[PDB]
Amino acid sequence: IFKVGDTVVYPHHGAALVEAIETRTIKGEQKEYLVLKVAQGDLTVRVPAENAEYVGVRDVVGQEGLDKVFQVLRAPHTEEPTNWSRRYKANLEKLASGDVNKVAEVVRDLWRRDQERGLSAGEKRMLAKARQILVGELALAESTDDAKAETILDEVLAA
């Protein structure tokens, strides 16, 4: 399925393009490396043709999962453990999982707790990073005008 011209989503680097299929030699054999161009830090990631699904290279989302993550973002549930260390560990695990609904849960919990209390600079950086990957994912998914993706993010945050 991975041809030149896609827009695939890495686990926690964001949505990236493809431009070539490298046949770079490993053990005297030409494993089909595919290249990536993710623009948050202009790093190029090259992965083997079959271990991408093992490491979690996930395709773009363009169906009722958009409504699913919208109702996840506008869900009434907000619960965290008592200690900030375990709460941060659980949110970091859900962030590193690389799932859109889980990242939506992370940003709704962090945005609710920041508009209620205001926690910390480290979780502020975490919320900025997770909001960046969610906004970039949906803006390259629906092709829906990035930063007007931020306006529709404001709409679903207002709920």
Residue ranges that bind DNA, judged by CB under 7 A: 84-85, 119-123
Least CB distance to DNA at residue 11 (A): 23
Question: Quick one: 25 or 85, whose CB is closer to DNA?
Answer: 85
What is the enclosing helix (H) or strand (E) of 16?
Answer: strand 14-17
Identity of residue 89: K
Query: Rounded to an integer, what distance in angstroms lies between the CA atom of residue 128 and that of residue 105?
Result: 14
Least CB distance to DNA at residue 113 (A): 10
Query: Would you give the end-to-end CA distance of the chain in angstroms?
Result: 36
Least CB distance to DNA at residue 80 (A): 10
Least CB distance to DNA at residue 40 (A): 22
SS3 at position 10: strand
Query: Rounded to an integer, what distance in angstroms lies between the CA atom of residue 129 and that of residue 123?
Result: 10
Q: Do β-strands 29-30 and 7-10 pair in parallel, antiparallel, or remain unpaired?
A: unpaired
Question: Quick one: 31 or 87, whose CB is closer to DNA?
Answer: 87
The strand pairing partners of 33, in sequence order, are 22
Question: Quick one: 17 or 119, whose CB is closer to DNA?
Answer: 119
Question: Quick one: 28 or 122, whose CB is closer to DNA?
Answer: 122
Matching residue, tokens 């993710």: 38
